Every structure is written in structure tokens, then in C-alpha cells.
Design an enzyme around this catalytic site. Structure first.
Site: not given
Ligand code: HEM
Ligand SMILES: O=C(CCCCCn1ccnc1)N[C@@H](Cc1ccccc1)C(=O)O
Ligand code: HEM
Ligand SMILES: O=C(CCCCCn1ccnc1)N[C@@H](Cc1ccccc1)C(=O)O
Lengths: 449, 451
Positions: B264, B389, B396
Site C-alpha cells: 500500500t 486511511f 489505519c
Molecule cells: C498509504 C498507505 C496505506 C494505506 C492506503 C492504508 C490503508 C488502510 C486502510 C484503508 C485501513 C482500514 C481497513 C479497514 O477498513 O478495515 C488500514 C488499516 C490498517 N493499516 Fe493501513 N494503510 C497504509 C499504510 C499502512 C502502514 C505503513 C502500516 C504499517 C505497517 C499499516 C497498518 C495498518 C493496520 C495495522 C491497520 C489496521 C488498523 C485497525 O485494525 O484498527 N498501514 N490501512
Molecule cells: O476487496 C475489497 C476490499 C479490499 C481492500 C484492501 C485490503 N486492505 C485494506 C487495508 N489494507 C488492506 N472490497 C470489495 C471490492 C473488490 C472486489 C474484488 C477485488 C477487489 C476489490 C470486495 O471484497 O468485494
């Protein structure tokens, strides 16, 4: 070691530095010059003013530091007595009163106070919608009307009726005059008998009103949804005892002081920061419109006002209205690995400077950005302490925030606001902080109640 | 009131629509046709894809909606376990790990991670300054090298040594292959005899991951103390329950951070550099800031905080192409969305993040243009309009990590090199569980500034 200290005044040490009408702000300018810690000397007392999260998170260790009564709190004790705020932790009446009153101040206890809070909130909204064109609003005076009336109605079912008066209720007149004389006794009896005769007459005015209300409620037997009921029926599980009638008086006096004056500064500072940042006001106004969908806000609707709460938290960051608290060292200890303190040595937490620790909040500490509190878990611990610390933290915190969120969500829903004077911030210092002269014009949005 | 729905495939409902190699982008084309909301049906599942700030700002109300594990996240859980990202909010291990790991991910914890990030960032700069004339840079491949080595070094003081390798590290070979097989289980069927090689490979892929991580935990458990996440996990104790994380959960967190870290965060840098070479005026402004700020051979933590425009550049890249493109939510009780779509308790929602970030009612008509100046004032942006995020307590945890790593690395790249889009690269976004600009290459001309 080698703790800084500001300029001295001969035999008075640092005491004349507080011989000013803005001493908390003067103490912040000293902390800006002298840094994380500095010693303040006066005839008969010595204290240390803490300003950094690095040092304050150690002072908040209740195993090493306990609440101390500052000279300001000791003078308030002459009429607030052994109420919660002016008693020592080791005093039998604190823990007794603390255990009886925590279930009455919980977030689930606010569901019962809600209806009475809306009673006062509607009075405020209706006053502003009954103004004429080009008439303005004295914000802190009307905010004080609402907070004082709210704790009176919810605390002991009494209506000060502040929105029916120009001069305040006689009780609040003497209360403010007692707080006034208490604050003046700090930087102070050759020609003070008039001052003392006025002081004792103001205490008797306060004691009489509360004592009759307690005597009336016991004799009538009527049960209400107010704190007075919980104090006559509540019994401390530890000692098995209920609060005696004298302590009940001190708690009601405590809630009336500790309630209204700090809680109206929060609303006054919030509205000021909303009209000084039109982008933030719009986001807060958008939430008020989307959430408060009924003519009468519900308890659940007030909890959904996330951004209003963040606005309130950021206002409490720049200008916390109860700006300081005192601590003493329970044993000999070393603060920050460099400042040895002996048992009984005192500390003071300069809350507004803590909330400007650049190593915690970044460089934009002076900007009003409620987005800091978008994620409440991200903020480090003991960096944000507008409500004190530990078991001696504010017991009415959930009270003050629910009332302020309800009223601000209602003001933002019903009115458009105009900083028609381009108000220059002038902070008046009492025992709390208030923006003096703050006025706005309100343009009704014509949404009925 | 009546929710739109895309075309159906008889008994398979809408699932064959995801039988494509760019399913997030395909989902964006549906959202353009059907609008702010539409129902997506599959055998055994029903979800609703939200795309407008008007409805998403309600979905982010945590009092009404909680994070759901999407079908993708359920499949990732087969090796991420009850790590932070693949556990439910009500599971005991989430709140525990959330409380233990939050102080290690703060903006104040980055001052300790900074030196190790600079360790990896200098390696990248020196690789690019050791290329010969007319040699180009495979951008996402080198950005992944940096993000993987950064999370390995800062997370558990392990050196994947990605800049010493042609073929990727053996660990990620199963790591990346397990995500591929996890993603393929979506547009697949259930378990038939045919997909047995996939299943035997899947379990051997997990055994590679578990064995490497568990040895690192056993190796550290030497007594050595470090400034890494692994140290905080072996010594940290949850203030609520007073308990520490057990060793099983700890590997799940490391596995989670290894996944959630590199791919990511490297897509963000890859998309950032793409948008910078496609907008020469923005690249110049960002390069000027790098020059007037990064005055030392090694950027400091305070210098990275001063890279305001680089941060705006990164945020604007996260608006157009957020690399974690979606998250799942479920309704905690019966509720009504936008006053017209009644939802039952347990009903699912999907936030199509790249479609949210193109809401013309929020960003104007130039939603497709790359203008980092949108983020000059964070208070001007409406609420829940920008969600790269995630949301709330399930947002995140590595947000400050990823942004500090990307701001430092991008500021160092803009200071040391001029960039040339020598192939007139046509954006081709490859989809795994994240988004990456595939085939993106540039030429870098060293500015000859020593480190
Ligand atoms: C720009 C880069 C990144 C993006 C776009 C991103 C995106 C996301 C998103 C959308 C979620 C929420 C997923 C959900 O709805 O359940 C998430 C959760 C999380 N991300 Fe990232 N992330 C990034 C970078 C990182 C990095 C560098 C780390 C650490 C190595 C990290 C660790 C986590 C963790 C541990 C969660 C879970 C938080 C929780 O469960 O409360 N992420 N991330
Ligand atoms: O996939 C997803 C969620 C995946 C999000 C990325 C996983 N993440 C989030 C934070 N760190 C990792 N949501 C839909 C849409 C979709 C379907 C098929 C392929 C791609 C996307 C689904 O599951 O149906
Ligand atoms: C926003 C407005 C308020 C602020 C900023 C505030 C702040 C504080 C602070 C900092 C303390 C601790 C002082 C110390 O260290 O000794 C305190 C104590 C207290 N506050 Fe408040 N307060 C507010 C409103 C209220 C209200 C509305 C009530 C209820 C009527 C209340 C009741 C108390 C009580 C009872 C204590 C004493 C607690 C104890 O002794 O353990 N406060 N307040
Ligand atoms: O501010 C304080 C005490 C704070 C009292 C707040 C009142 N409260 C407490 C709980 N709920 C309301 N103490 C300092 C600074 C000061 C000096 C002179 C005048 C004003 C303030 C001191 O004693 O020097």
C-alpha cells in the site's frame, strides 16, 4: 537541576508578578521565556510551574503525586468547605462524597438530566430569536445565564431564572463577590474589615439559600431527577454512611461555582473560535443540521455530534477555562531525571502551556484545528488535560460536555453568526477564563422548535 | 428509495462482474452509471457500494456502523489471523493489540524510527545515483524495495536487503502469492478437487510465513532491546486488561505489518511520482520546497515535518488513487441511510474510496486533475470526504508511519534528481488487493548533491 526562576521583587520574591488582572496569561509568557519548568517564590510558599508533557505525565502519576490545595482553592474553601473540589484526598468526606456522586455523573446518568438541559437550551434559543434587527448578543453573559440555570435545575431543581433578569440572581451576586474577594486575597489586614464584613455577608447569603432548599426537599419528601435527591438517598458503600446536611450544602455550592463559570467559558471560547474560522463553523453547522432532525434534540442525537465535540475539545485546548491544578510530592522523588523534589514539595500544572507543547501537537499549536481530535485515541496520554487528572479529575466532565454539545449544536442549527465588530480577544481572569466583550449578531434560520 | 443494481448473470447474480483483472476500476465504472449507491449480489452475500460523501459520512458514524471483514479480508485472515486488520472490533485481541501498539505508531514515535528509515532512503538514492546514462528506473519495483525494507527494519530490525536482490525475498514470494490466491478465491466458484494445487500451495505458503516470523520472535526473545515494534510487543502490556500479547498474536501482527506496510505504501509513492512527472509545474514547486528545506546531507525528523507541499502532493495522490481502495461496514442496528435506504441490522456496506474522492459536489468539476493545493487547509475539506486511511478506531494505525516514510523519501528524491517521463508512460493500474501503476518507468538525472 538548575531550575529557572523569573524576576524577583525584593522581599516579596515573585508574588507581585501575580499583582495583575491576567495572572495565568502572565504565567504563560514566563513559561514561554523560561521553558519547561520554573520555580515561583512568594512569602511563605514555593511552587514549580510545569508546562511540558514530558514533565506533566510524571506529575500525573498518582503513586508519586496527589492533589494539593492551591492558595486559590484554600480561599474558596472558606465557603465551598469539604466539597469534592476543595477537600484533600485523605479526608473522609472526599471519598465518601466521591463514591455517592459518581453514579449520578456517569454518561448513563445524563439521560435523566437531558430533559432539563433542553429546558434551558430552548430559553437561550428563544431569547436570540426574539432580538430585533441590528441588536447584538453578549456571548459570555448569555452563556453564563445558560450554564448557571442548567446546573441549578439539574442539580437541585431550582430556577435562578437568569433569562428573566438583567442583574444576576442575588445568590450568584454574592457567589461572584466571594470568588472575587478570594482571588484578591492572593496578591494581598490594615484596611480590610469592610472586605471581611462583605465576605461573611456573602457567605451567609449563599448558605441560607442552599440550606432552605435542602430543608424544603427533605420536609416535602418529593423525589426528583436531580443531584439533591441522590445526596439525601445515597449511601457510600465503603463507610455505609450518607452525606450529612452540611456536606450536602458544600457540594451544592461546589456544583454551582464549579459548574457555571468554567462551562460558560467553554461555550464562549467555542463560539469565538467558530466565528474566527468560517470553514470550521460551516462543518460544525452542517453536522448540526444533519443530526438534529427533530424540533427537540434527543440524548442520542447529541451524542452523534462528533464534530461539535471536536470543536469543543480544540477550544478547551487553546483556552481551558479551569486553567491549572496543584500537586504535592507524596515522597522524595526525582522529576524528569533532573529535578529532585522533597516530600511535600508542590507542583502546578499550567494547562494552557501543556496544550501548546510543540513536541506533542506540532508547530501549529496556536491554530484552531478541531481535526486534531478526529481520532481521540491518537493523542498521547496526559497531553490534553482540561479536566484535571486521575481520581481528582473533574466529576462533572460528562455533564459539562453534554450540555455544551447540546447547546452549541442548537445554536449552530438555529442561527447564522456574524462577528460584526471583528472582536479582538480580551481574556478576563477570575478563577476561570472568559473572552470579555465578545459580541456577535445572530441571523435566525427560521427553524421552529 | 429503490436501490440500483448492475447487470446479473442468472444464478451467479453479479459475481462474474468481478471476474476481471481490474475489479476496483470496473466497480468505479458501475458507480459512474448507477450513482451514489448500488447493490452487489453474489451467491450467499449481499453488499451495497457507497460512492458519495453524502452517504459515506453517515456510514462513518461508528454508533450505527462497525467495521466488517470483507470477503477479501476473510481470506487474508487465513494467515493474518487476529492481527489488527483482520480481527473484529469486539474480539478481545483487537482492543488489546490496539492499546499496546498505538504508542509505537504515534507521530512522536517516528523520531525513533526516523534514523532507520533514512538508512533505507539513502540506499534508494544511492542506487539511482549509481545507474549509467540512458538507464531507467522501474518505479513501483524500487518503491516496493524501500517500503518493504523500511517496515522490516523499523518493525523487527530485520534486513530483507531488497536493494541487493533481483528475485524478491523468499518470505514475500509466499506472502505475495498467498494474497494472489486469496484474491482468486473471490472470483472462484466452492472448494473443488481441481483447486487442490492452489490449496496445497496455500498452506505451504503460510508455513513459509509463520516459520520466518516465529524464528524472529524466538531469536529476539537474546534479551536485546530495540526501538522497533517487536520490542514493544514483547514488553508491552494492555492498560485495560493488564495482559500482554501472546506469541501467536505477535506473529500475526508482524505478518500484518509486512503486508499492510510495503504494497500500500509503495503504490502511494509510485502514484505520487507518476502524478509529479505528468504535472511538471507541481513537480517543480515540490522540488523547490525539497531544496529550500532539506539543507543537510541527511534529512532530520523536523525537516520532514516542514515538507508541507510534499505532504499535499502525497495526499492528492491518495485522493485520485488510494492504494487500499475499499473497506467494509455493517449496520449495528436497523437504520436508514440518507433518509431513503432502510438497512437491517447486519447489512453490509462498501466504501468505494476512489469513487468517493471524485465526488464533484465536494471537489468541484476538476476532480480528475492533480492539484495538491486542495489540501492547503484541512478544515476546508468537508467531513468524511477524504478517507484514504479508513475510519474511526478501525482507521489505519500506520498512517503516520507511511506518510513519514513517503514524505522523507519523496523529499529526498526531489532534492537529488530531475525526472523525465521518457516513455510517455500510459497509466496502467494493476490490481491485487492494492493498486499499483504497472510498467511505470522514469529516467533520473542526478543533480550531483552528496549525501
Ligand atoms: C498509504 C498507505 C496505506 C494505506 C492506503 C492504508 C490503508 C488502510 C486502510 C484503508 C485501513 C482500514 C481497513 C479497514 O477498513 O478495515 C488500514 C488499516 C490498517 N493499516 Fe493501513 N494503510 C497504509 C499504510 C499502512 C502502514 C505503513 C502500516 C504499517 C505497517 C499499516 C497498518 C495498518 C493496520 C495495522 C491497520 C489496521 C488498523 C485497525 O485494525 O484498527 N498501514 N490501512
Ligand atoms: O476487496 C475489497 C476490499 C479490499 C481492500 C484492501 C485490503 N486492505 C485494506 C487495508 N489494507 C488492506 N472490497 C470489495 C471490492 C473488490 C472486489 C474484488 C477485488 C477487489 C476489490 C470486495 O471484497 O468485494
Ligand atoms: C468545561 C468546564 C469544566 C472544566 C474545564 C472543569 C475542570 C476541572 C478540573 C481541572 C478539575 C480538577 C481540579 C483539581 O485538580 O483539583 C475539576 C474538578 C471538579 N469539577 Fe470540574 N470542570 C468543569 C465543569 C464542571 C461541572 C459542570 C461540574 C459539576 C457541576 C464540575 C464538578 C467538578 C468537581 C466536583 C470537581 C472536584 C473533583 C474532585 O475533587 O475529585 N466541573 N474540574
Ligand atoms: O489558577 C489557579 C487555581 C485554579 C483554580 C480553578 C478553579 N477551579 C478548580 C476546579 N474547578 C474550578 N492557581 C494559580 C494561578 C492563578 C493565580 C492568581 C489568580 C488566578 C490564577 C496560582 O495559585 O498561582
Amino acid at each position: 537541576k538548575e531550575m529557572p526562576q523569573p524576576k524577583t521583587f525584593g522581599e516579596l520574591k515573585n508574588l507581585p508578578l501575580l499583582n495583575t488582572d491576567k495572572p495565568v496569561q502572565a504565567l504563560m509568557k514566563i513559561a514561554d521565556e523560561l521553558g519547561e519548568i520554573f520555580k515561583f517564590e512568594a512569602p511563605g510558599r514555593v511552587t514549580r510551574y510545569l508546562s511540558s508533557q514530558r514533565l506533566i505525565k510524571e506529575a500525573c502519576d498518582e503513586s508519586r503525586f496527589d492533589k494539593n490545595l492551591s492558595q486559590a482553592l484554600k480561599f474558596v474553601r472558606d465557603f465551598a468547605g469539604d466539597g469534592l473540589a476543595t477537600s484533600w484526598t485523605h479526608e473522609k468526606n472526599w471519598k465518601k462524597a466521591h463514591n455517592i456522586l459518581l453514579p449520578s455523573f456517569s454518561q448513563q446518568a445524563m439521560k435523566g438530566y437531558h430533559a432539563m438541559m433542553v429546558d434551558i437550551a430552548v430559553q437561550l434559543v428563544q431569547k436570540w430569536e426574539r432580538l430585533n434587527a441590528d441588536e447584538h448578543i453578549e456571548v459570555p453573559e448569555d452563556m453564563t445565564r445558560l450554564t448557571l440555570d442548567t446546573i441549578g435545575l439539574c442539580g437541585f431543581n431550582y430556577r435562578f431564572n437568569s433569562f428573566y433578569r438583567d442583574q444576576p440572581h442575588p445568590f450568584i451576586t454574592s457567589m461572584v463577590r466571594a470568588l472575587d474577594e478570594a482571588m484578591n486575597k492572593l496578591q494581598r489586614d490594615p484596611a480590610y474589615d469592610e472586605n471581611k464584613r462583605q465576605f461573611q455577608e456573602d457567605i451567609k447569603v449563599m448558605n441560607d439559600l442552599v440550606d432552605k432548599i435542602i430543608a424544603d426537599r427533605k420536609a416535602s419528601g418529593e423525589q426528583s431527577d436531580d443531584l439533591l435527591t441522590h445526596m439525601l438517598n445515597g449511601k457510600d458503600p465503603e463507610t455505609g454512611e450518607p452525606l450529612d446536611d452540611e456536606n450536602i450544602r458544600y457540594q451544592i455550592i461546589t456544583f454551582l461555582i464549579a459548574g457555571h463559570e468554567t462551562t460558560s467559558g467553554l461555550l464562549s471560547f467555542a463560539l469565538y473560535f467558530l466565528v474566527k474560522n468560517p470553514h470550521v463553523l460551516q462543518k460544525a453547522a452542517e453536522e448540526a443540521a444533519r443530526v438534529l432532525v427533530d424540533p427537540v434534540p434527543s440524548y442520542k442525537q447529541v451524542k452523534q455530534l462528533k464534530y461539535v465535540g471536536m470543536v469543543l475539545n480544540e477550544a478547551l485546548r487553546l483556552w481551558p477555562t479551569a486553567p491549572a491544578f496543584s500537586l504535592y510530592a507524596k515522597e522524595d522523588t526525582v522529576l524528569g531525571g533532573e529535578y529532585p523534589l522533597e516530600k511535600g514539595d508542590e507542583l502546578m500544572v499550567l494547562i494552557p502551556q501543556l496544550h501548546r507543547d510543540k513536541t506533542i501537537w506540532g508547530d501549529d499549536v496556536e491554530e484552531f484545528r478541531p481535526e486534531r481530535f478526529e481520532n481521540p485515541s491518537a493523542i498521547p496520554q496526559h497531553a490534553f488535560k482540561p479536566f484535571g487528572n486521575g481520581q481528582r479529575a473533574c466529576i462533572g466532565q460528562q455533564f459539562a460536555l453534554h450540555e455544551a454539545t447540546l447547546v452549541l449544536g442548537m445554536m449552530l442549527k438555529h442561527f447564522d453568526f456574524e462577528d460584526h465588530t471583528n472582536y479582538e480577544l480580551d481574556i478576563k481572569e477570575t478563577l476561570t477564563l472568559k473572552p470579555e466583550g465578545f459580541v456577535v449578531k445572530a441571523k435566525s434560520k427560521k427553524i421552529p422548535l
